[PDB]
Amino acid sequence: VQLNQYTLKDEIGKGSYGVVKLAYNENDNTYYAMKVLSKKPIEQVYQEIAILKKLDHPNVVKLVEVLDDPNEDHLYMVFELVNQGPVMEVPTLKPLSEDQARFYFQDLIKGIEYLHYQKIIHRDIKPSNLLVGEDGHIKIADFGVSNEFKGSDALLSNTVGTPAFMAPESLSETRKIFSGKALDVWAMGVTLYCFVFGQCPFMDERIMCLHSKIKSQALEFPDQPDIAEDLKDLITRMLDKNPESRIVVPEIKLHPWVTR
């Protein structure tokens, strides 16, 4: 099963986009992650490639090349392999320790800060898009619904990403305008909660009820495991339902739980 210089091996990830397969480059004798899509708009895929091309940071994945045959339904995006895979699956019954979560969250901060400087809102931050590399550090993946903006922030009206991680101000259903950086902070907060608890803070298999909880259910902490007050404060500040008072990234950097 060959595609120019790449030999497609087993599937390593999966999603609505298609699949990611391990891949072997015969030229340089090296494994890569191959994202395979099937046209079925396709514009959005090319928006991601444009964003990805501009990105160069240790906590962000690296697109290597794009293989697009006008006469083939499949479109191939070659990424550098982040060899240990997602940092966790949600839900799990073995969440990370605080110090493990702190370690990874520190990577998340650096990556998100870089993307915002580069004027990219990620919009699909979640533990399964945080890939763990050879040195144990996280790289941010799946820019499938990211936005680029001009100015100091994005002014958005569309609702995309993973539902359990969407921010309440993006679920208005009246097409209201909301700012972009605070959407990534919210999802970072859901993510950190997942790190330590192994489940999202707002769950419901009915989508209406999931939206309702995100918009109107006060954040609740499980008795177990008994996490630190300063970590509760940080998650509480990141999951502030009012994006105007929600904690910003420069404050997250300085937060007591992050710096200890």
Binders of ligand 91O among 112-131, rule CB under 6 A?
131
User: Minimum distance from CB of 7 to Cl ion (Å)?
Assistant: 29
DSSP state of 203: -
33 binds, among ligand 91O, Cl ion, none (CB under 5 to 8 A by kind): ligand 91O
Which residues, at least 6 apart from 151, have a Cβ–Cβ distance to it below 8 Å? Answer: none
CA–CA distance, 40 with 205 (Å, rounded to integer): 27
User: Minimum distance from CB of 75 to ligand 91O (Å)?
Assistant: 11
Query: Of the ranges 14-22, 31-39, 121-129, 132-140, which one interacts with Cl ion (CB under 5 A)?
Result: 121-129
Give the Cα-Cα-Cα angle 143, 144, 146 (nearest 5 degrees). 60
Decide: helix, strand or coil at residue 2: strand
105 scored as a contact of ligand 91O (CB under 6 A): no
187 scored as a contact of Cl ion (CB under 5 A): no
Is the distance from CB of 101 to CB of 192 less than 8 angstroms?
yes
The annotation status of 12 as a binding-site residue, yes or no, is: yes
CA–CA distance, 12 with 193 (Å, rounded to integer): 25
Among residues 124, 142, 184, 240, which one is catalytic? Answer: 124
The annotation status of 35 as a binding-site residue, yes or no, is: yes
Q: Within 10 A of 50 (CB to CB), how many other CB atoms are there?
A: 10
Q: Where is the binding site for ATP, in residues?
A: 12-20, 35
Q: Which residues are at the interface with Cl ion (CB under 5 A)?
A: 90, 126-128
Q: Which residues are at the interface with ligand 91O (CB under 6 A)?
A: 12-13, 15, 17, 20, 33, 35, 48, 61, 79, 82-83, 85, 131, 141-144
